[PDB]
Write a protein that binds this ligand. Sequence first.
Ligand code: NDP
Ligand code: NDP
Lengths: 285, 295
Amino acid sequence: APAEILNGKEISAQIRARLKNQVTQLKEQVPGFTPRLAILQVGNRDDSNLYINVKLKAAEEIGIKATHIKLPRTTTESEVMKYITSLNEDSTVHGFLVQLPLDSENSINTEEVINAIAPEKDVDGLTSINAGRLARGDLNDCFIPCTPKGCLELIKETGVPIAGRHAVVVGRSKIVGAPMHDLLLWNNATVTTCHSKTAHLDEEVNKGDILVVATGQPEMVKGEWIKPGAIVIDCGINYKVVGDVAYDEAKERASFITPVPGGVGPMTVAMLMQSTVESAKRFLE
Amino acid sequence: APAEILNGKEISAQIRARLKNQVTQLKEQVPGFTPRLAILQVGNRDDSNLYINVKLKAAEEIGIKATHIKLPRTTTESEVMKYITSLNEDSTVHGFLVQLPLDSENSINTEEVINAIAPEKDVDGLTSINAGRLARGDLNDCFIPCTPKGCLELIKETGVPIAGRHAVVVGRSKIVGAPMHDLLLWNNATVTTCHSKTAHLDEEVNKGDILVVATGQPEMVKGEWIKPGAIVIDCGINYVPDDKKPNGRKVVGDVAYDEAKERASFITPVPGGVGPMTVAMLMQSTVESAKRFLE
Ligand SMILES: NC(=O)C1=CN([C@@H]2O[C@H](COP(=O)(O)OP(=O)(O)OC[C@H]3O[C@@H](n4cnc5c(N)ncnc54)[C@H](OP(=O)(O)O)[C@@H]3O)[C@@H](O)[C@H]2O)C=CC1
Ligand SMILES: NC(=O)C1=CN([C@@H]2O[C@H](COP(=O)(O)OP(=O)(O)OC[C@H]3O[C@@H](n4cnc5c(N)ncnc54)[C@H](OP(=O)(O)O)[C@@H]3O)[C@@H](O)[C@H]2O)C=CC1
């Protein structure tokens, strides 16, 4: 009856187990070497503290050393830049990220802080250098944002080839929608990108053989709009916790669907660990 | 009720006249200020020499100081790198570009040469950093590659708002299709990107209220595919022998113009649509860079 559930909890546990074995093998080859991730937080939001704790738990399980630096809410852009520079120059740190959003009493230009991160350590894939490689199809060379990466792995778990499909991405943020569009295009989908100024969103969603939703508007994408047999990837986390897709209705139209929670969420953490292991391996290569 | 023709020759000439007036006024508001472009060439390709002469003559008519550095075919990659660093560090040069393709007897990594250009001076807009800013919506200060920048100016000359329209871009190159998608997306069109692996391309093109075609596939996009009333921008430059022309050849676009003009509301002819805008767009990006430096 209903769509096949893309179980992100199970898929991500498989990815984390493979990464744990790859890091154990790297440690056997170069005893004493330890892949290391740093997370820089500004402020003390409760949601960011919980998400960072999930990232630190996954890192510890895989065998990655993970450092959390937490700066106060009085922090300035200059003070944050100092910590980024320190991390860029610390040879023991292979990858690092800035947890977003920054929670400070002062105005801080997020793009400037993010673009101070060395591209080789930019495991969240948000620097303009990494975004510009991805946006132009240059994939040998770059870190891809973890949520889109996770979404692409979920779509590949269906076994249905992406090339030639019509994909619709709802949302164009730097963290999710814009890079998701690029991943699907460079995997040879024909891609439509919709956003808050799209007219007739229902008609555009209905064109989607693959549909990735990342709007942060609870259950806004109605099941009725889904193209029968579509693969539906829902990145929304909205407070019950619900996605950006009305799941009970969409599951009767899609072929494959991600639940919320347990879909994209766990895959994003697995993909950050995969990028961190790659950053350690590139360092060794 | 055929389409209105978007005359790129006349619109580019107006843009260049406005830029000239802007440059005169900047020079009078800030005595001594001298907007400056540099063009770095490696080797001596005839095609390159022709294109560079056009850009230099356009810069000087506007009042932009344009410097041409021509390095010999025996130049090595490290030599080109040193010149790019010097131009990055030269506070008198507000924008510069590397003429492609390089013509050297030595292997030179073109991607590494271009990505050595400081993003704040990349007037051609193809560094990965500039591409990343444009792709993520930083249109207030990034540089836009000239061909898509001239496509957008032609779309805006129609007077029809872009926001909320469904735009289709056929082609996804670094030079045209990919930056064109970003310009339409961040002008709030809903954008569909198509390419050589698109199935049912005609059905996709027929959804386009705005259509920009940049494939190099001569007259592939037939008139019947055009959505009635669309704005049709054709970037193609395709040569076809035609003994009835002065020079024995005609230029055709990537759209079958004769049938598409009966369907579109606005259309760019080929020749004379997108083509004539490109140098004016590079001069517009050079004045933008000079103004950002001035501030
Ligand atoms: N599990 C995880 O680890 C992650 C979950 N997410 C979740 O993904 C969702 C989106 O996050 P993020 O991308 O950062 O969000 P942003 O709020 O930055 O962007 C949301 C996007 O959705 C668009 N949008 C909003 N309303 C509509 C609408 N009515 N119709 C069409 N488009 C609309 C916006 O349009 P416009 O650009 O016009 O403003 C914008 O492009 C959130 O629920 C977030 O919590 C995100 C990252 C990670
Ligand atoms: N007037 C000017 O100064 C300029 C004119 N142009 C003209 O624009 C045109 C394209 O140039 P450029 O973008 O550099 O070219 P490229 O060859 O780099 O890119 C061609 C693009 O068109 C797509 N394409 C090719 N065949 C088809 C097809 N059959 N169906 C759908 N899509 C297809 C390709 O798809 P895929 O990605 O799948 O390979 C690719 O994305 C050319 O005619 C060029 O001369 C370009 C620059 C400047």
